[PDB]
Design a protein that fits this description.
This is part of a larger assembly, with 5 copies of chain A, 2 copies of chain C and 2 copies of chain D. In chain C, about 40% of the residues lie in helices and about 15% in strands. Chain C is built from 24 helices and 22 strands. In chain C, the strands form 8 sheets. Chain C has a 4-stranded mixed beta sheet with strand order 9-8-11-14. In chain C, strands 15-16-10-17 form a 4-stranded antiparallel beta sheet, with helices on both faces. In chain D, the strands form 4 sheets. A 6-stranded mixed beta sheet of chain D has the order 5-6-9-10-11-12, covered by helices on one side. The longest helix of chain D has 18 residues. Classes of the chains: A alpha+beta, C alpha+beta, D alpha+beta. At the B-C interface, loops of B face α5 of C. The PDB classes it as viral protein. The entry lists the keywords Viral polymerase, viral protein.
Chain lengths: ~50, ~50, ~725, ~400, ~70, ~50, ~50, ~50, ~50
């Protein structure tokens, strides 16, 4: 559900469907990355999956 | 009761009954059974005539 | 690297990912309730201990009256409601609306004169005094009707609720009270029989006023347990009438969140916030108070509700005014039953024993735990000898939801105090209120908030300063629905609804798919989520009924027969998921029952067998639930072999009389019959006509006719 | 049994479950289109969840069901079987030759006749055919194109004609009801589609009031549907000079008030004080509807500026040739000449904010809006508690 | 019209009811039982028409007297 | 019997390691779901 | 005089034909049945 | 066709349809494919000539 | 439809003339009182085309 909402929000921005873009990315949009963890006080990103 | 009177009786008969009640200073709302009786009386009279 | 789920909120707003915060997937908390009930009584009396303490001379139980009591001098909860202020709020509401009170009272009276006694059979479990337990509403009403017949009480046979309430009020005066009680006689076996028991007037009054208690275990999002109270049948009629009146009044009030439910409530919420945003002055601030009231029923005196009922019916017949004022009177003198009692054990002897409540004080208090020691030392003054607590002040949760909401809306609608440069308005619904205060700056906004808090404290309402907060308009929460910048996320809490409905195969499937489609419509469940929900539901549905795909190598009793059917029939796309058929449901066709969906794909033999006009698995008496799935949810199914029913887990008198009447007049099962004559004569006439028609058609033999007519004459109808 | 055993009759399902197979037919022959992933504006509306063969009130539905599938126990047919005689005979013929338990057929007929309505968020079409598939068509941030596999205009015209015929005479009510219950639309009196739809045009509401039916209690002023929110307005007579120079004695509302206002596809909130309009919030729906809403709310508010904006004359009548009250004369004058009070009303700076944006006199989404008017880029949902309160008919 | 009136003996079905010529008397059961006596109709009725004509006559009388 | 209150403990270390380990790909897959009907509308194609 | 139980008293039996009495009685019986279905029959109280 | 005849039989000088609903939905004017950026098509595998 | 003193007139000049004529007509028909009239001419005097 939540991830669906996330993807839908992205789709609201630009018209086409991004489920391939958020997961793996495409030639026009970089893969979507969240903030997932940390190490030595340095937060680390993480893929959509 | 007034809902039944509205459903089962025409607006004309209801108006005649209300006028008759007003002539007698009797409130139709406070005596819905009497209003129904007067409406039935008018309806049966019209049906006879 | 150390993972951290909370970091998701760094890249996402909390409201967007609010669904993940709630742990609505684990085991909900579940439970003796006597401790909680005693604590609730203790708190209820503590909040109003400064009131006027007297002794009821009708029942002998201590009573505490907080109304018109000392004005609180501390933030602690206060039940000291001033009657004049309540009447002022009611008068302001009346002025702000065109004769709303009169219209609501008249409509309540009209629908009351049309209501039947059997409406009391609805609802939940109810306290039964003939056994002093909790029994289903229907059984409790039937037992009280039966008992009343012995003491020269009638009106239930007279139909309408007016005679039933009249003879209920009469029953409180009979010098005795006879009824039937269950006697578990030893014979070793314990056989239950009916024993004609009698009780005095005081005992009957106490029984009628007693409120049974139970633990609210089903709660999901609260660590500490609350006790829910069930009332007797002698209060159900009056409470129902007052609740209907309050619903009529509050429905028009735009400030009331009840009784509208679903997208209507979201519409009201968004409309209200938009209205307040529009009404703001230039450069002023409209602050929203997210409020979550606590002790919402331990501070509301039933006397205030009596005053509200009298003021609401200012212009109405005296008889109706007296009738609708009985419920506040019964609640103002209520008594609370006390669970099943504490349990004392010795570990040096491996011994344990539960102590019934009547014996609470038969033991030296030095043996209970210190906490229960203090609880009993504080409960002693109000403890009845029979084992009940005298609980006059306050209310138990769930009784006057509509009336309490109306009082809250009355508090909201004052809209000003002292002509100060601000205004306020909001939404209130049964212990959850969201307020909006418009002013020219934050300081005046909180001046208004404080004024509203003080005004609430003048009616027994005490907003929780710990569970509430304030912010700028455009971001708040109401009844677990979150609003932020126009986005109202329906907090995804309908997840625990994808299990099989447990009524039968076809009906369970229809209910599940309709639930999925309704969730898609309402909660914004995405298409991928709906497809995965279909997948999971089909998995659970196949597992629960032991019917997987016929091709699959799973073993089972019915699975062997499903395998047989898989190749015994050519058309393999028409079988049902209950017959190991392939799933066909998708988003586009969740609104179509599958039987009609697969009708083309079936085989003539298969559809003939499954859709037989007569099925031993389908019975007429099983049709009761074909309309509404127990909330009454409408579902669409199809008659077939999979429309069966599960085995079961003056009773026989009424049951078989009704069953026989239905079997005679098949139209009765659908619409209410009409007639001013005894059931026996109607059945006799119908059966005589049916016998004559059966013979004339050759369906009955002559000896059969003569036997039937002899029986009918013996009945005394020929 | 599903594998072997007795083989039944397949005929009954062709017609008995007609509604379900019609649903399947509408799904199968439907044509799909593109998907628009952009945000979708949705309004909460009272919509009929499923199409109905012939919408009727619950009591008439039950009586019809009994008259269909319960030949016995049919004492004294009421004034409802003659209206639905065609439905009675059609369903009777269709269901004859079956062996299903009668209760199943009764419940299915109840579904097929009794209406089911709910509040739903909708955007676009609203017929039950589209509502059936609303779960797929709509979407918070996605929309799909769908085309599923009349009497209304005729009833509007008939009700208007009846109103015009009856008004000109004395005692209009009796004549109007006589014509209404003596009228017919190709198979049935007018109490077959009036009783079907909820509310409708003002003429239909007036006729329903003259007949026996329930009408939504929204206040109709011209085209505006008004729902009071709060405040009480004291209607007191006052002598006011009109912009034309004439002086008229009319009723004015002392005190502050607020109303939810609807007109066609335009919704809004209006807050007015005596002899002045204070605030108006609207959503962008349609230029024609927005102009109608603005002008009608202007006339209703009885703002002194509206009176001072008159330039022509007020002596109009109706098709029946009657002189109306000055309020409706002003309504007609301003609607005929929309650019009369708009020019002299005065302008107000644009609603500087995240979403609140103005609208000019030409109805284009242009800044430098009218004094008071505001257009919010949000959804205004109004008209709750449709109590259908008791209403009398003069 | 009338009550049970057992002179006809037992009740008769709709099919046997149709056999009776217009103006006859028959013994039937109304709703769930309720024996009654009925008379076959010789016409088709319209209560609305009757009420409307009665109102028309009443107002004609009122106007003529006025 | 006196009520038995839960112990007041401290932050462990196994919880974090399990949180990390259960959230990593493995060559082994167990979660399987039943099939659904063919998807003919574009919306259900996107959903698939 | 007509009653709700399908009986009547007429000063003259030729004043009304069979159809008129039958129709009035049918209307009265329908009213009675509808009232009973709405439970207004018992609540209803006559002209005395 | 009904809309066309209604427009022809009206009084306004213009010959412009005002009930665009059936006109739009009848000629398949809403079923036209939506053009997307070439990059997505290159990335996508289901887009074939 | 067309009240523009077109022909290279500065749009500000055309606005000034239009508002002057509108104020004149409003006062002549009585839409504005003498106070509003004088206030409008004051502002129009401040414009530069009056």
């Amino acid at each position: 559900q939540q991830m669906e909402a996330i993807v839908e929000q992205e789709s609201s921005i630009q018209g086409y469907d991004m489920t391939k873009a958020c997961f793996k990315g495409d030639r026009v949009n970089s893969p979507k990355t969240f903030s997932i963890g940390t190490q030595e006080g340095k937060l680390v990103k993480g893929s959509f999956g | 009761m007034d809902t039944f009177i509205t459903r089962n009786f025409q607006t004309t008969i209801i108006q005649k009954a209300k006028n008759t009640m007003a002539e007698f200073s009797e409130d139709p709302e406070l005596q819905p059974a009497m209003l129904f009786n007067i409406c039935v009386h008018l309806e049966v009279c019209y049906v006879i005539s | 690297m150390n993972i951290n789920p909370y970091f998701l909120f760094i890249d996402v707003p909390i409201q967007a990912a609010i669904s993940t915060t709630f742990p609505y997937t684990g085991v909900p908390p579940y439970s003796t309730g006597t401790g909680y009930t005693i604590d609730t009584v203790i708190r209820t009396h503590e909040y109003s201990n400064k009131g006027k303490q007297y002794i009821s001379d009708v029942t002998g139980c201590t009573m505490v009256d907080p109304t018109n009591g000392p004005l609180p001098e501390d933030n602690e909860p206060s039940a000291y409601a001033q009657l004049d202020c309540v009447l002022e709020a009611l008068d302001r509401m009346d002025e702000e609306h065109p004769g709303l009170f009169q219209a609501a009272s008249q409509n309540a009276m009209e629908t009351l004169m049309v209501t039947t006694v059997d409406k009391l059979t609805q609802g939940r479990q109810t306290f039964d005094w003939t056994v002093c337990r909790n029994q289903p509403a229907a059984t409790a009403l039937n037992t009280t009707i039966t008992s009343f017949r012995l003491n020269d009480l009638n009106g239930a046979d007279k139909g309408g609720l007016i005679p039933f309430c009249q003879d209920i009020i009469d029953s409180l005066d009979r010098p005795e009270m006879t009824f039937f009680s269950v006697k578990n006689i030893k014979k070793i076996k314990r056989i239950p029989m009916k024993v004609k028991d009698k009780i005095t007037k005081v005992e009957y009054i106490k029984r009628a006023l007693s409120l049974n208690t139970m633990t609210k275990d089903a709660e999901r999002g609260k660590l500490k347990r609350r006790a829910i109270a069930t009332a007797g049948i002698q209060i159900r009629g009056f409470v129902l009438v007052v609740e209907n009146l309050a619903k009529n009044i509050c429905e028009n009030l735009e400030q009331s969140g009840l009784p509208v439910g679903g997208n209507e409530k979201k519409a009201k919420l968004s409309n209200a916030v938009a209205k307040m945003l529009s009404n703001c002055p230039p450069g002023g601030i409209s602050m929203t108070v997210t409020g979550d009231n606590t002790k919402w029923n331990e501070c509301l005196n039933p006397r205030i509700f009596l005053a509200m009922t009298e003021r609401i019916t200012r212009d109405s017949p005296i008889w109706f005014r007296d009738f609708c004022s009985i419920a506040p009177v019964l609640f103002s003198n209520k008594i609370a039953r006390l669970g099943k009692g504490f349990m004392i054990t010795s570990k040096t002897k491996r011994l344990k024993a539960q102590i019934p409540c009547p014996d609470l004080f038969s033991i030296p208090l030095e043996r209970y735990n210190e906490e229960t020691r203090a609880k009993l030392k504080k409960l002693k003054p109000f403890f009845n000898e029979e084992g009940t607590a005298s609980l006059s002040p306050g209310m138990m949760m769930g009784m006057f939801n509509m009336l309490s909401t109306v009082l809250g809306v009355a508090a909201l609608g004052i809209k000003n105090i002292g002509n100060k440069e601000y205004l306020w308005d909001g939404l209130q619904s049964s212990d959850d209120f969201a307020l909006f205060v418009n002013a020219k700056d934050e300081e005046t906004c909180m001046e208004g908030i404080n004024d509203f808090y003080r005004t609430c404290k003048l009616l027994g309402i005490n907003m929780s300063k710990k569970k509430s907060y304030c912010n700028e308009t455009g971001m708040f929460e109401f009844t677990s629905m979150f609003y932020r910048d126009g986005f109202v996320s329906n907090f995804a809490m309908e997840l625990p609804s994808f299990g099989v409905a447990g009524v039968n195969e076809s009906a369970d499937m229809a209910i599940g798919m309709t639930i999925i489609k309704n969730n898609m419509i309402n909660n914004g469940m995405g298409p991928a989520t709906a497809q995965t929900a279909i997948q999971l539901f089909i998995a659970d549905y196949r597992y629960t009924y032991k019917c997987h795909r016929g091709d699959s190598k799973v073993e089972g009793k019915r699975m062997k027969i499903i395998k047989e059917l898989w190749e015994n029939t050519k058309g393999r796309d028409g079988l049902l998921v209950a017959d190991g058929g392939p799933n066909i449901y998708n988003l586009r066709n969740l609104h179509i029952p599958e039987i009609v969906l697969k009708y083309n794909l079936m085989d003539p033999e298969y559809k003939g067998r499954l859709l037989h006009p007569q099925n031993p698995f389908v019975g007429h008496l099983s049709i009761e639930g074909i309309k509404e799935a127990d909330k009454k949810m409408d579902y669409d199914a199809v008659s077939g072999t999979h429309s069966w029913r599960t085995k079961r887990n003056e009773e026989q008198c009424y049951a078989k009389c009704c069953n026989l009447f239905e079997a005679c007049f098949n139209s009765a099962s659908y619409r209410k019959p009409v007639g001013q004559h005894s059931m026996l004569e109607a059945m006799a006439h119908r059966l005589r006509m049916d016998a004559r028609l059966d013979y004339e058609s050759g369906r009955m033999s002559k000896d059969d006719f003569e036997k039937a007519m002899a029986h009918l004459g013996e009945i005394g109808y020929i | 049994w599903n594998t072997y055993g007795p083989i039944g009759d397949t005929e009954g399902f062709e017609r008995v479950y007609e509604s379900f197979f019609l649903r399947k037919m509408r799904l199968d022959n439907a044509t799909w289109g593109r998907i628009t992933f952009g945000p979708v504006e949705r309004v909460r509306k009272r919509v009929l969840l499923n199409p109905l063969t012939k919408e009727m009130p619950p009591d008439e539905a039950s009586n019809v069901i009994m008259e269909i599938l319960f030949p016995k126990e049919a004492g004294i047919p009421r004034e409802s079987t003659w209206i639905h005689r065609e439905l009675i005979k059609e369903k009777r013929e269709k269901l004859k030759g079956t062996m299903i338990t009668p209760i199943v057929l009764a419940y299915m007929l109840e579904r097929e006749l009794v209406a089911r309505r709910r509040f739903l968020p909708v955007a676009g079409a609203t017929s039950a055919e589209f509502i059936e598939m609303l779960h797929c068509l709509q979407g918070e941030n996605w929309r799909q194109i769908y085309h599923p596999g009349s009497r209304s205009q005729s009833m509007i015209v008939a009700c208007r004609k009846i109103i015009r015929r009856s008004i000109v005479a004395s005692n209009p009510l009796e004549l109007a009801v006589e014509i209404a219950n003596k009228t017919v639309i190709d198979t049935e009196p007018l109490k077959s589609c009036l009783a079907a739809i909820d509310g409708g045009d003002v003429a239909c509401d007036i006729i329903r009031a003259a007949l026996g039916l329930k009408i939504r209690q929204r206040q109709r002023f011209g085209r505006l549907e008004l729902k009071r929110i709060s405040g009480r307005g004291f209607k007191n007579d006052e002598e006011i000079l009109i912009g034309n120079g004439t002086i008229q004695k009319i009723g004015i509302w002392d005190g502050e008030e607020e109303f939810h206002v609807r007109c066609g596809e335009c919704r809004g909130i209006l807050k007015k004080s005596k002899m002045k309009l204070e605030k108006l919030l609207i959503n962008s729906a349609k230029k024609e509807d927005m102009r109608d809403l603005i002008i009608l709310c202007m006339v209703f508010s009885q703002d002194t500026r509206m009176f001072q904006g008159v330039r022509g004359e007020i002596n109009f009548l109706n098709r029946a040739g009657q002189l109306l009250s000055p309020m409706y004369q002003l309504q007609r004058y301003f609607l005929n000449r929309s650019n009369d009070l708009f020019d002299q009303w005065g302008y107000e700076e644009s609603p500087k904010a995240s979403e609140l944006h103005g609208i000019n006199e030409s109805m284009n989404a242009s800044d430098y809006t009218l004094k008071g008017v505001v257009v919010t880029r949000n959804v205004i949902d109004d008209f709750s508690s449709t109590e259908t309160e008791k209403v009398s008919i003069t | 019209s009338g009550k049970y009136d057992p002179d006809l003996g037992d009740f008769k079905t709709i099919e046997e009811l149709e056999k009776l010529k217009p103006g006859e008397k028959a013994n039937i059961l109304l709703y769930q039982g309720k024996p009654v006596k009925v008379v076959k109709r010789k016409r088709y009725s319209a209560l609305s028409n009757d009420i409307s004509q009665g109102i028309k006559r009443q107002r004609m009388t009122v106007e003529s007297m006025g | 019997e006196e009520p038995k209150i839960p112990n007041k403990c401290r932050v462990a270390a196994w919880v974090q390691t399990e949180m990390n380990l259960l959230s990593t790909l493995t060559s082994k897959r167990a979660l399987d779901l039943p099939e659904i009907g063919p998807d003919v509308a574009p919306v259900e194609h996107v959903g698939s | 005089i007509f009653s709700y139980n399908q009986d009547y008293s007429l000063s003259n039996e030729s004043s009304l034909d069979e159809e008129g009495k039958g129709r009035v009685l049918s209307r009265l019986t329908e009213l009675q049945a509808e009232l009973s279905l709405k439970n207004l029959w018992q609540v209803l109280i006559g002209e005395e | 066709w009904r809309d066309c005849v209604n427009t022809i039989s009206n009084e306004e000088m213009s010959n412009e349809l005002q009930k665009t609903n059936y006109a739009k939905w009848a000629t398949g004017d809403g079923l036209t494919y939506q053009k997307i950026m070439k990059e997505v098509a290159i990335d996508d595998e289901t887009m074939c000539q």
